[PDB]
Structure 1
Amino acid sequence: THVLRFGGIFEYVESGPMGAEELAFRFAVNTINRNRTLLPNTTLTYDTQKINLYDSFEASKKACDQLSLGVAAIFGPSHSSSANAVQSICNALGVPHIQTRWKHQVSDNKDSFYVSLYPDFSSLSRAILDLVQFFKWKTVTVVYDDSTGLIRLQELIKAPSRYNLRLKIRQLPADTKDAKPLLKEMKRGKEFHVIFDCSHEMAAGILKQALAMGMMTEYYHYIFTTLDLFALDVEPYRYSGVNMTGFRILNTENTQVSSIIEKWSMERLQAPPKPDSGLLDGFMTTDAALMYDAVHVVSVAVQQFPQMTVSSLQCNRHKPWRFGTRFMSLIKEAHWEGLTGRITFNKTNGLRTDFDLDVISLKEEGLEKIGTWDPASGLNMTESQKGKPANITDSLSNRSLIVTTILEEPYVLFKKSDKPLY
């Protein structure tokens, strides 16, 4: 076949360069067009637009401007207010809606034509709950930033009803990243085991104020819910004796993955440097890694379907598209080895609930992988206690002191009883 066109709805950065998800959408179309062996006699074209990420009326116009011009798929406005408005357009027209960002699915929607490549927090909240039991905790101090983070972690708030924990849920200030009045009350409470449900732009901002206070010590543990923990500048915190455990779905131990990331930062020549950000470099964050995987999983679906002609559907006279119900069945049944590992979608939902995580943690050489989470397996946190330096203290103390002792009355005799003793 020919042109087949993809749609896009992305950030309108008024001053600076194009967005990180919008580069990774153009980088993935150019990769599949150049490397011929995926879609050999089929090319791709993009139709990206700009919204304000909060006006659902603007995201609804730019969807119907792409539906009238004709696309094959919408690749997500990537915000909870505006993705829900484009999700219902894509349902009523037939076209799929691929989205690379977490969104509260209201439990009574009848939306069928969407997949979400972000790791679903119904699966992730088990992964944190496996960590807070692997470290044998009894008190946690879950800290979020916005009110929707209670939905992101509701399998962790519902933990003391069945397990032995003590949740002490707190909230960060509004935007206002000076969270020192919050961190001061966490010191008075002796709250040493903390879970942050915040993005890495804010997770690199609390640690400047957990260091300005006396909270980056050997007593404090920190679990982060974000998957961009590897993209933090951790040089000030590497020697503190802290613990910073987290996850990483970005498959950075593969040669094929790391070469694209080196080709990514080559394409990030328009990088704004910020020394006060607390972030390392223009790494491919996991919100831009999933947009790279969003194009390829749909590219598996167009490979198995050389009958697809893009129509020109309206919105005021909406009709289900002729090939929408079959092409959506191919996306939900497609497997791919992307930069985030194994992509497979849940047939009931369209949500990634089966995925491979890597438990990274902070040691004195930087962030290091110490385990692996998997929904079928659980924690495979090996860690072995072999590869460590010397000088551990051990006490033999064989104070059993085996006495040889016969029975001979009055000296030694069995105690008279009915129960068994030992």
Structure 2
Amino acid sequence: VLRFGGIFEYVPMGAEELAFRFAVNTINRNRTLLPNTTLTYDTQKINLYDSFEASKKACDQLSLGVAAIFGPSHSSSANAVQSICNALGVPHIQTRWKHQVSDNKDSFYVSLYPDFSSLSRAILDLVQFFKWKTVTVVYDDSTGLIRLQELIKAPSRYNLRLKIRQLPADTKDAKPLLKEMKRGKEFHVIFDCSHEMAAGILKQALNMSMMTEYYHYIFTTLDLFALDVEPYRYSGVNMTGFRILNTENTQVSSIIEKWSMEPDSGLLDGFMTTDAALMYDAVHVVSVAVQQFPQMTVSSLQCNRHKPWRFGTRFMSLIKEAHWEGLTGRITFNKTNGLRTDFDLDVISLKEEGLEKIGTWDPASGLNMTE
């Protein structure tokens, strides 16, 4: 019997927090996992973008005695708990993308979120398939540039002429930006934002008769198809994106169901995000690591009192090597970056019947289209 850690936003409850609890409870029930063990956990609710509070709440979970911390979903917060985890030798489990640094030499952490250099290369692979010559990439926050940088420096190695814009704070302030694209005849567009931001801008692009067949939008969000695309079914507009969540598999469909069993924004109700799906998978991927390490026993470690974690290098090694078929498909880590650089995607596009798989992608095979 051992304990896990968790840090989530403070507020109604969070979707990642529920995917975490729900995950350890189905690990308890399921015989195959922990036939001689039981998962308990400790939840901490911190105000995000607060490195200090995240570090303290982290140290409280460390003295309490955890085998791994599932840190916050933010840049600053996650970097703090990542450094504390690397110091005291306790594994850090990130479920989102954060800006990494070459200088940084932390090793006690892994990220289940699909390496975003693989996704940027999948996007341009999709632009190659569409034979696009021009394209306007519009991002939400500045980190978007660091994210899909492999796409930004394609025009230098390729024959591409892409403009690049950004949208302000207000959601509905996207109309002026849309006026400039409409006016600039920029029909091929990539959007770097959350599926919520996306559903919001599509509702405005619609008001600006911008949903014709001339336009073709690609989306960064993997939760693209948790969107109510009903209003744009027969508008003639094309839309494409990726999906790492294998909802095609019924095992995944039933898990998503018992999870959803527990407003007019444009989103569909009763859906599981990839952030929630990645937290659920994280719990399972670390459960298979501890499964191969029956001699595990948490320990009370203090931040002020320097003291590495006993079974750290061993546990972290079993985690970076773990291969697990989860909701998001085959899960494996780049031995160098402990970063998930190899994964399977399903390219999907809007049709007159709705969004549907038109092919697959992956860093290896490249781009396979079911013509």
TM-score where L is the length of structure 1: 0.87
Shift of 1:37: 1.4
CA distance in 2, matches of 1:78, 1:299: 21
Q: Which of structures 1 and 2 has the bigger CA Rg?
A: 1
- Aligned residues of 2:171 and 2:197 also touching (Cα < 8 A): no
Give the aligned partner of residue 379 of structure 1.
367
CA separation of 1:263 and 1:10: change in aligned 2, threshold 3 A: same
TM-score where L is the length of structure 2: 0.99
Task: Answer 1 or 2: which has greater strand percent.
Answer: 2
Shift of 1:178: 2.7
Task: Answer 1 or 2: which has greater helix percent.
Answer: 2
Query: Could you list the runs of 5+ residues in structure 1 that have no partner in the other structure?
Result: 268-274, 384-422
Deviations 1:367-390 (A, max 9, x none): 00001001110000122xxxxxxx
Higher mean Cα deviation, 20-29 or 169-178? 169-178
Shift of 1:108: 1.1
- Aligned residues of 2:4 and 2:69 also touching (Cα < 8 A): yes
Shift of 1:206: 0.5
Deviations 1:210-247 (A, max 9, x none): 00102101000000001001110111011111111000
Shift of 1:124: 0.5
Shift of 1:177: 3.5
Deviations 1:62-102 (A, max 9, x none): 00000011101011201011100110000000000001011
CA distance in 2, matches of 1:237, 1:280: 14
CA distance in 2, matches of 1:176, 1:362: 23
Shift of 1:282: 2.5
Deviations 1:156-211 (A, max 9, x none): 10011010111101001124443000000001110000000000010000001100
- Aligned residues of 1:335 and 1:343 also touching (Cα < 8 A): yes
CA distance in 1, matches of 2:76, 2:309: 25
Shift of 1:11: 1.3
Count matched residues: 371
Shift of 1:351: 0.6
1:204 aligned counterpart, secondary structure: helix
Q: Quick one: percent identity of the two aligned structures?
A: 99
CA separation of 1:121 and 1:77: change in aligned 2, threshold 3 A: same
CA distance in 2, matches of 1:332, 1:163: 35
- Aligned residues of 1:243 and 1:361 also touching (Cα < 8 A): yes
- Aligned residues of 1:143 and 1:169 also touching (Cα < 8 A): yes
- Aligned residues of 2:172 and 2:204 also touching (Cα < 8 A): no
CA separation of 1:92 and 1:175: change in aligned 2, threshold 3 A: farther
Deviations 1:336-388 (A, max 9, x none): 000000100010001110000000100010100001001110000122xxxxx
Give the aligned partner of residue 175 of structure 1.
170
CA distance in 2, matches of 1:113, 1:27: 25
Alignment of 1:17-416 (within 5 A): 17-267=12-262, 275-383=263-371
1:305 aligned counterpart, secondary structure: coil
1:9 aligned counterpart, secondary structure: strand
Deviations 1:291-319 (A, max 9, x none): 00000000010110011111100000121
- Aligned residues of 1:178 and 1:209 also touching (Cα < 8 A): no
- Aligned residues of 1:228 and 1:286 also touching (Cα < 8 A): yes
Shift of 1:35: 1.1
Shift of 1:39: 1.3
CA distance in 1, matches of 2:33, 2:309: 25
